[PDB]
Design an enzyme around this catalytic site. Structure first.
Site, PDB file in Angstrom:
ATOM      1  N   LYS A  48       1.087  -0.899   0.045  1.00 25.07           N
ATOM      2  CA  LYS A  48       0.199   0.072  -0.118  1.00 25.07           C
ATOM      3  C   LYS A  48       0.748   0.957   0.075  1.00 25.07           C
ATOM      4  O   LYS A  48       1.497   1.634   0.913  1.00 25.07           O
ATOM      5  CB  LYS A  48      -0.778  -0.303   1.423  1.00 25.07           C
TER       6      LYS A  48
ATOM      7  N   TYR B 233      -1.760 -10.919   0.650  1.00 30.30           N
ATOM      8  CA  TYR B 233      -2.047 -10.225  -0.549  1.00 30.30           C
ATOM      9  C   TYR B 233      -3.632 -10.918  -0.530  1.00 30.30           C
ATOM     10  O   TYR B 233      -3.919 -12.613   0.108  1.00 30.30           O
ATOM     11  CB  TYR B 233      -1.386 -11.305  -1.648  1.00 30.30           C
ATOM     12  CG  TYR B 233      -1.733 -11.233  -2.989  1.00 30.30           C
ATOM     13  CD1 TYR B 233      -2.993  -9.936  -3.400  1.00 30.30           C
ATOM     14  CD2 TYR B 233      -2.032 -12.428  -3.960  1.00 30.30           C
ATOM     15  CE1 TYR B 233      -2.659 -10.053  -4.887  1.00 30.30           C
ATOM     16  CE2 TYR B 233      -2.971 -11.881  -5.395  1.00 30.30           C
ATOM     17  CZ  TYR B 233      -3.359 -11.143  -6.177  1.00 30.30           C
ATOM     18  OH  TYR B 233      -3.743 -10.795  -6.912  1.00 30.30           O
TER      19      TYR B 233
ATOM     20  N   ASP C 168     -13.310  -2.430  12.847  1.00 25.80           N
ATOM     21  CA  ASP C 168     -14.186  -2.353  10.814  1.00 25.80           C
ATOM     22  C   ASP C 168     -14.187  -3.313  10.403  1.00 25.80           C
ATOM     23  O   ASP C 168     -13.615  -3.672   9.614  1.00 25.80           O
ATOM     24  CB  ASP C 168     -13.762  -1.292  10.712  1.00 25.80           C
ATOM     25  CG  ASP C 168     -14.222   0.685  10.944  1.00 25.80           C
ATOM     26  OD1 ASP C 168     -15.540   0.276  10.320  1.00 25.80           O
ATOM     27  OD2 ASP C 168     -14.227   1.475  10.813  1.00 25.80           O
TER      28      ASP C 168
ATOM     29  N   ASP D 144      -7.889  -3.296   8.096  1.00 24.09           N
ATOM     30  CA  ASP D 144      -8.506  -2.388   8.564  1.00 24.09           C
ATOM     31  C   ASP D 144      -6.967  -0.864   8.088  1.00 24.09           C
ATOM     32  O   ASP D 144      -6.049  -1.013   7.146  1.00 24.09           O
ATOM     33  CB  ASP D 144      -7.818  -2.286  10.043  1.00 24.09           C
ATOM     34  CG  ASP D 144      -9.537  -2.758  10.630  1.00 24.09           C
ATOM     35  OD1 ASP D 144     -10.305  -1.377  10.614  1.00 24.09           O
ATOM     36  OD2 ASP D 144      -9.371  -3.504  10.862  1.00 24.09           O
TER      37      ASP D 144
HETATM   38  N1  LIG Z   1      -4.106  -6.802   0.187  1.00 19.19           N
HETATM   39  C1  LIG Z   1      -4.786  -6.413  -1.248  1.00 19.19           C
HETATM   40  N2  LIG Z   1      -4.743  -6.640  -1.421  1.00 19.19           N
HETATM   41  C2  LIG Z   1      -5.760  -6.670  -2.576  1.00 19.19           C
HETATM   42  N3  LIG Z   1      -6.306  -5.928  -2.822  1.00 19.19           N
HETATM   43  C3  LIG Z   1      -6.515  -4.955  -1.774  1.00 19.19           C
HETATM   44  C4  LIG Z   1      -5.434  -4.703  -0.977  1.00 19.19           C
HETATM   45  N4  LIG Z   1      -5.453  -3.764  -0.317  1.00 19.19           N
HETATM   46  C5  LIG Z   1      -6.539  -2.952  -0.932  1.00 19.19           C
HETATM   47  N5  LIG Z   1      -6.695  -3.505  -2.035  1.00 19.19           N
HETATM   48  C6  LIG Z   1      -7.522  -3.066  -3.280  1.00 19.19           C
HETATM   49  O1  LIG Z   1      -6.896  -2.143  -3.886  1.00 19.19           O
HETATM   50  C7  LIG Z   1      -7.762  -0.675  -3.240  1.00 19.19           C
HETATM   51  C8  LIG Z   1      -7.369  -0.023  -2.470  1.00 19.19           C
HETATM   52  O2  LIG Z   1      -8.243   0.698  -1.022  1.00 19.19           O
HETATM   53  P1  LIG Z   1      -7.925   1.252   0.083  1.00 19.19           P
HETATM   54  O3  LIG Z   1      -6.591   0.181   0.742  1.00 19.19           O
HETATM   55  O4  LIG Z   1      -7.411   2.367   0.309  1.00 19.19           O
HETATM   56  O5  LIG Z   1      -9.789   0.855   0.989  1.00 19.19           O
HETATM   57  P2  LIG Z   1      -9.596   2.075   1.488  1.00 19.19           P
HETATM   58  O6  LIG Z   1     -10.089   2.014   2.785  1.00 19.19           O
HETATM   59  O7  LIG Z   1      -9.406   3.599   0.749  1.00 19.19           O
HETATM   60  C9  LIG Z   1     -11.821   2.442   0.783  1.00 19.19           C
HETATM   61  P3  LIG Z   1     -11.814   2.124  -0.888  1.00 19.19           P
HETATM   62  O8  LIG Z   1     -10.927   0.999  -1.160  1.00 19.19           O
HETATM   63  O9  LIG Z   1     -13.235   1.758  -1.444  1.00 19.19           O
HETATM   64  O10 LIG Z   1     -10.704   3.011  -2.154  1.00 19.19           O
HETATM   65  C10 LIG Z   1      -8.752  -1.759  -2.784  1.00 19.19           C
HETATM   66  O11 LIG Z   1     -10.624  -1.340  -3.163  1.00 19.19           O
HETATM   67  C11 LIG Z   1      -8.733  -3.308  -3.124  1.00 19.19           C
HETATM   68  O12 LIG Z   1      -9.967  -3.160  -4.181  1.00 19.19           O
END
Ligand SMILES: Nc1ncnc2c1ncn2[C@@H]1O[C@H](COP(=O)(O)OP(=O)(O)CP(=O)(O)O)[C@@H](O)[C@H]1O
Ligand SMILES: Nc1ncnc2c1ncn2[C@@H]1O[C@H](COP(=O)(O)OP(=O)(O)CP(=O)(O)O)[C@@H](O)[C@H]1O
EC number: 2.7.11.1
Lengths: 87, 247, 248, 52
Positions: free
Chosen positions: C36, C86, C130, C148
């Site tokens: 991330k 992942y 959450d 989270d």
């Molecule tokens: N371990 C993980 N593995 C695969 N995909 C992930 C992931 N973590 C996040 N994502 C994917 O990439 C996107 C990253 O968004 P994020 O993790 O920031 O959630 P968020 O709290 O901002 C609300 P939203 O997902 O609707 O934007 C996610 O929508 C998800 O599809």
């Protein structure tokens, strides 16, 4: 005041097509329409994801007054915006 | 049903990141007030619009001389306005920066006014009152006023670890505030967030030499890891060091 | 302990509110991980840097098969990186929107997986996670993964009113998700804050015509205003409707 | 790797809480280190990558 813009797009002998401009998510829009100056104003709502609405069932040769105000989810309704259109 | 046209603005009292606040006067009555402005875009990106609207309703059922009043609110296309009571003498945080530390008489008086407002809050089933020095306002007579509308150094270990908590949270923050008022810095302050986090969990703090024996006893009773072992608010008001120095 | 040169960043997996999450393969062990990439400038402008850093500390100590793991983190001069587990099959919110509602055996299996994770959290006295569908990821075998980092529809009455709360708040959220899994929307969804505040505080919800008696019995027991009347997590796992449709 | 590599300066934009030097520690407000491997320390996320 949001909606900052308002206009009649298409119109029809006994129908109307209104549209408005918000930079902020709204729950829904409260659309009410009545003749300027004598009768209870009709009311209906349109979801906040839409930017236009249809008002039908009017009467020709009548100057109507269309007021629209959005509703914030947490803080309530905004100030209305009026417009005029003679059928 | 208040609006922007009903107020006469004055000098800006502050300007942070999430918003600002100016001196305000209602045009009809010329009554001095404070108008705090918050941006809906900023509160939406951080998820505070939920808790801001919640605290607006919460603080309307609370009436205490040591809690800042909220008389109403209004909004427009891009801002949120809160009509607050005017605190002429500013914040405790700013006053703490100018004098480093407070004397024992002023410190004990602040704790009494804080504990009284928290006892009224707990009686009204209100749980967590963020009593950071930035949120402590001073009235015309110097009285403390809680204005709940960074926070790491003031929360007990049960909050920073995501565990359950109750009204015993305010007892820990009182001990952190009582330490900061007399010493000048929070007892668990360090250079790293990781270091300050671990120091809170271990209750890793020491008393400077000038801290009196009565102040050390009160702080030691409050800064306890177990919330059940912390005193109750009326025990703080009955403490000998408090009753001897407060007003 | 970590740097940018230790990973092979691949295609993006979705945009975030403060950055973007990419597929990262480590240079040494060649392990597939999720990275991330959160931007500092937006974390400092929105005031969520301390909130995420605090949740990073909490999530780094919770190791459960139904909780997305936080192996570590690092940062640069203007971004923050997080080494996440992942999750190939995306989020539950996306598949809750791809369809309309879920099965009875898919809902009960998800509730059983969630009740097991919250039993692990409550054992460490860690409450209130959450678990909304947007924060629920899918593993390789369709297992629920709690991640989270609007949200009023999942809060119990003791939280929207601003009062103290215990571990019974997660029992409330468990019933809200069970309803949303079978219906497609939270049971207290409204068009305003006051209308949502009144529906949650007074517990005003209705079951559609296709809700099984065994399903509405569990939801009715979990969605109670008094938290002391909410069942135990082991009572949810020992529920007749749960044990007849789960796969634990 | 926080960038510019005995009076040694860095001119690192970043901010930085303090700089430990392989052991001393200079304040983050200063951009130089007078000694008689550098680790830049951030408040929330800890140390940066070393150099070297
Ligand atoms: N371990 C993980 N593995 C695969 N995909 C992930 C992931 N973590 C996040 N994502 C994917 O990439 C996107 C990253 O968004 P994020 O993790 O920031 O959630 P968020 O709290 O901002 C609300 P939203 O997902 O609707 O934007 C996610 O929508 C998800 O599809
Ligand atoms: N009733 C009131 N009376 C007088 N001053 C007030 C006030 N309410 C707020 N303020 C002034 O503005 C400051 C509080 O508002 P502020 O927006 O700065 O805090 P905040 O919680 O939003 C985080 P930050 O301080 O970083 O902005 C105080 O320093 C105070 O000087």
């Amino acid at each position: 005041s949001v909606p900052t813009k308002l206009e009649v797009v298409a119109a029809t002998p006994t129908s109307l097509l209104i549209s408005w401009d918000p930079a902020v998510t709204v729950v829904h829009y409260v659309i009410t329409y009545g003749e300027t100056g004598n009768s209870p104003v009709q009311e209906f709502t349109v979801p906040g994801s839409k930017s236009t609405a249809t008002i039908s069932g009017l009467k020709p040769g009548v100057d109507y007054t269309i007021t629209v105000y959005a509703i914030d989810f947490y803080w309530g309704s905004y100030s209305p915006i009026s417009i005029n259109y003679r059928t | 049903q208040w609006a922007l046209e009903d107020f006469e603005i004055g000098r800006p009292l502050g300007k942070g990141k999430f918003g600002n606040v100016y001196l305000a006067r209602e045009k009809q009555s010329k009554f001095i007030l404070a108008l705090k402005v918050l941006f809906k875009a900023q509160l939406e990106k951080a998820g505070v619009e939920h808790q801001l609207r919640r605290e607006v309703e919460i603080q309307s059922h609370l009436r205490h001389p040591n809690i800042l009043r909220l008389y109403g609110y209004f909004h427009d296309a891009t801002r949120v306005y809160l009509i607050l009571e005017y605190a002429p003498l500013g914040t405790v945080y700013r006053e703490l920066q100018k004098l480093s530390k407070f004397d024992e008489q002023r410190t004990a008086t602040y704790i009494t006014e804080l504990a009284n407002a928290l006892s009224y809050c707990h009686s009204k089933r209100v749980i967590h009152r963020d009593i950071k020095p930035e949120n402590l306002l001073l009235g015309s007579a110097g009285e403390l006023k809680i204005a709940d509308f960074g926070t790491l150094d003031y929360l007990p270990p049960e909050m920073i670890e995501g565990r359950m908590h109750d009204e015993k949270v305010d007892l820990w923050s009182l001990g952190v505030l009582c330490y900061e008022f007399l010493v000048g810095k929070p007892p668990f302050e360090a250079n790293t967030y990781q270091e300050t986090y671990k120091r809170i969990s271990r209750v890793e703090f020491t008393f400077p030499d000038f801290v009196t024996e009565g102040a050390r006893d009160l702080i030691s009773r409050l800064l306890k890891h177990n919330p059940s072992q912390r005193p109750m608010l009326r025990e703080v008001l009955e403490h000998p060091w408090i009753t001897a120095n407060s007003s």
